[PDB]
């Protein structure tokens, strides 16, 4: 931003856009290098009552894998999942 | 005791593969010496191949000797095409290691190796 107005106009013409609106070099507009100290919030289980650990344990709820068929009617043909639905063309920039 | 064969049905076919591998290695030793500019004689390389073949000559399992033949084929393919370097070929000939002691008195003098 330390450049003259004729160089500004020459750059704007040769690039075809307003370069000085969005500069690629940072200036005073950014946040300051020093900040006030924060106060970090607490989680959901920092209570004092009804907070027994056995009712919210994540690791202990893991179960061993369930064996379906083990080697020690006209059932319908099944699939692993319903088929993936057809993708919708984007209404914003369809490129068409 | 019933096992799946790979290439060799019996010991005779595995010995045939071993002889084929030795034939190919004895053929390709002079070209390996000449192409890599190895500074050793042809006899040194050929007797090195003989020494390795006699070193691995204690196996009675057809599958193990078959896998040894396959790995020798891998080494032959990496040697015939220039994928190795001078150092990869020369790694067989240990030239930097000092001769280790073998009798009990010298090993007793050196260290605690049993």
């Amino acid at each position: 931003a330390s450049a003259t107005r004729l160089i500004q106009g020459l750059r704007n013409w040769a690039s075809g856009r307003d370069l000085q609106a969005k500069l690629q070099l940072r200036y005073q507009e950014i946040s300051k290098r020093t900040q006030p100290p924060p106060k970090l919030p607490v989680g959901p289980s920092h209570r004092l009552s009804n907070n027994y650990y056995c009712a919210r344990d994540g690791r202990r709820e893991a179960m061993p894998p369930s064996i379906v068929m083990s080697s020690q009617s006209e059932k319908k043909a099944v699939s692993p999942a319903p088929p993936i639905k057809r993708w919708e063309l984007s209404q914003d920039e369809p490129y068409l | 005791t019933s096992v799946k064969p790979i290439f060799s049905r019996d010991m005779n076919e595995a010995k045939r593969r071993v002889r084929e591998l030795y034939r190919a290695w004895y053929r390709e030793v002079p070209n390996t010496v000449h192409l890599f500019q190895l500074d050793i004689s042809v006899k040194q390389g050929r007797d090195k191949v003989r020494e390795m073949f006699k070193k691995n000559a204690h196996v009675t399992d057809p599958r193990v000797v078959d896998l040894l033949v396959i790995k020798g084929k891998m080494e032959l393919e990496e040697t015939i095409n220039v994928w190795k370097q001078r150092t990869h070929v020369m790694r067989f000939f240990h030239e930097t290691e000092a001769p280790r002691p073998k009798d009990f008195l010298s090993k007793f003098y050196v260290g605690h190796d049993p």
């Binding site: 080697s71 006209e74 319908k76 043909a77 088929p83 057809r86 | -």
Partner: protein, 113 residues
């Protein structure tokens, strides 16, 4: 509709999809006839092939076929039918409706050790 491209590279558009689909479904039924009746693969593949043949017989429109069959483009449906015919030929080749060839050792699928 006569679409110029299907969107996928290396997939030519077929002019008449109904005749090709009917030919493929009749051929896979003929091939699956050789499978013994007690095989589960024959039952399930015959069921889904008859269902797809009924769907392709009932409606004549290409877009409604691609929406009802939900297999994407009709070229993908034709390719899947050809792959299923190849699988059926390999299936009568392999004969996998026989029982277990070998049983695993007692510590083969035990995790953890």
């Amino acid at each position: 509709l006569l679409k110029k491209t299907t969107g996928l590279v290396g997939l030519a558009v077929c002019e008449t999809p109904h005749e090709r689909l009917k030919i493929l479904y009749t051929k896979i039924l003929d091939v699956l006839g050789h499978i013994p009746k007690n095989a589960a693969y024959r039952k399930y593949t015959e069921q889904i092939t008859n269902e797809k043949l009924s769907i392709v017989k009932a409606e004549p429109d290409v877009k409604k076929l691609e929406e009802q069959l939900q297999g994407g483009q009709i070229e993908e449906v034709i390719l899947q039918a050809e792959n299923e015919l190849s699988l059926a030929r390999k299936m009568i080749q392999w004969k996998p409706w026989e029982p277990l060839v070998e049983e695993p050792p007692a510590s083969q699928w035990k995790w953890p050790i």
